[PDB]
Design a protein around this ligand. Structure first.
Ligand SMILES: O=C(CCC(=O)NCCc1ccc(Cl)c(Cl)c1)NCCCCNc1nc2cc(C(=O)O)ccc2c2cnccc12
Length: 330
């Protein structure tokens, strides 16, 4: 069978916690009344949720209401308990209330509101400093939740709020987040295609926090090269082909052989033979102003087949790419 794997940081933090910290299936939820909040308008819809701007009528504060589409009650307790465990952590969205509509009885989460910016205008004026500043802020949120025994598993642009007038960032949607336990085998059908780590695409199930750091590397690559998404695959299998055409196929096959992964019979005939590309091949006149040796060095250290050899959140925050943003934060 497959060769085991353990996270090389924060490996046992959940085992040293009280059982109730991670045993979310027995978390008792106190359901308030959604009639404390008046919905203003729809902000988005997903597989697992519809999200609304709303007003807290008690104090007129703008707020956000996520009405959960019908999932296993388990998964709702999971998201609540993760949100409750991370409350007050750096750049993690704050859960404000837990309610049920009194007529429909369906469960919903109330979150803090973030005054987002025109992202269309943001990505057309992005500076090199902006990318380094907000990458750093996302890393603060990942290192914290990782240190708290929790993988986000759905890191992607849609899940980063930014109030640029206030340089304020929040990591949202913890509905796929999960507790890390050494030796546990997780569902690979998580995250969005363009950000899925190779471990998800080859059905390696004993993955860990390092899955988030792949996803972060996909974000980095699309920003600095102005190509979104960076790996644009038609399906899950063509997703690994897109990656193979860049990271190369020697390395992917060492990865398979190292963890003794049984590769799908579909993949043999489509992965081919491909050289590892030099990152220069994705630089051009319209994106060079965001590319630098340190940027590329940091990106290359995030996008590794082998989850174990990618940078940890904390290692990432010590990379030279962030030297000037760390300085200015003092
Ligand atoms: O607008 C976007 C595009 C997000 C985007 O492109 N960002 C910039 C990426 C980026 C750019 C530059 C850099 Cl340099 C980097 Cl690194 C990254 N997506 C949101 C649509 C859904 C509805 N929005 C709200 N959903 C919530 C969901 C929850 C939850 O489920 O927990 C909690 C709270 C909220 C919430 C709170 N306040 C306001 C709105 C919402």
């Amino acid at each position: 069978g497959p060769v085991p794997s353990r996270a090389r940081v924060y490996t046992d933090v959940n085992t040293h916690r009280p059982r109730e910290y991670w045993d979310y299936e027995s978390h008792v939820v106190e359901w308030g009344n959604q009639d404390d909040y008046q919905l203003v308008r729809k902000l988005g819809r997903g597989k697992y949720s519809e999200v609304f701007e709303a007003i807290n009528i008690t104090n007129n504060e703008k707020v956000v209401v996520k009405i959960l589409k019908p999932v296993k009650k388990k998964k709702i307790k999971r998201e609540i308990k993760i949100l409750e465990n991370l409350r007050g952590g750096p750049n993690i969205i704050t859960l404000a209330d837990i309610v049920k509509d009194p007529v429909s009885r369906t469960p919903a989460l109330v979150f803090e509101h973030v005054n987002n910016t025109d992202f269309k205008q943001l990505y057309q004026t992005l500076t090199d400093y902006d990318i380094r500043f907000y990458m750093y802020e996302i890393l603060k949120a990942l290192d914290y939740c990782h240190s708290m025994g929790i993988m986000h598993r759905d890191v992607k642009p849609h899940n980063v709020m930014i109030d640029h007038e206030h340089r304020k960032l929040r990591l949202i949607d913890w509905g796929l987040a999960e507790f890390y336990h050494p030796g546990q085998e997780y569902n690979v059908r998580v995250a969005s295609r363009y950000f899925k780590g190779p471990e998800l695409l080859v059905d390696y199930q004993m993955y860990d926090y390092s899955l988030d750091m792949w996803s972060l590397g996909c974000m980095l690559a699309s920003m600095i090269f102005r190509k979104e998404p960076f790996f644009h695959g038609h399906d899950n299998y063509d997703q690994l082909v897109r990656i193979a055409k860049v990271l190369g196929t020697e390395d992917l096959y060492d990865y398979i052989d190292k963890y003794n992964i049984e590769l799908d019979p579909r993949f043999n005939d489509i992965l081919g033979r491909h050289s590892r590309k030099r990152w220069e091949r994705f630089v051009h006149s319209e994106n060079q102003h965001l590319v630098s040796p340190e940027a590329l060095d940091f990106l290359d250290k995030l996008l590794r087949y082998d989850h174990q050899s990618r940078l940890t959140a904390r290692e990432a925050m010590e990379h030279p790419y962030f030297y000037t943003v760390v300085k200015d934060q003092a």
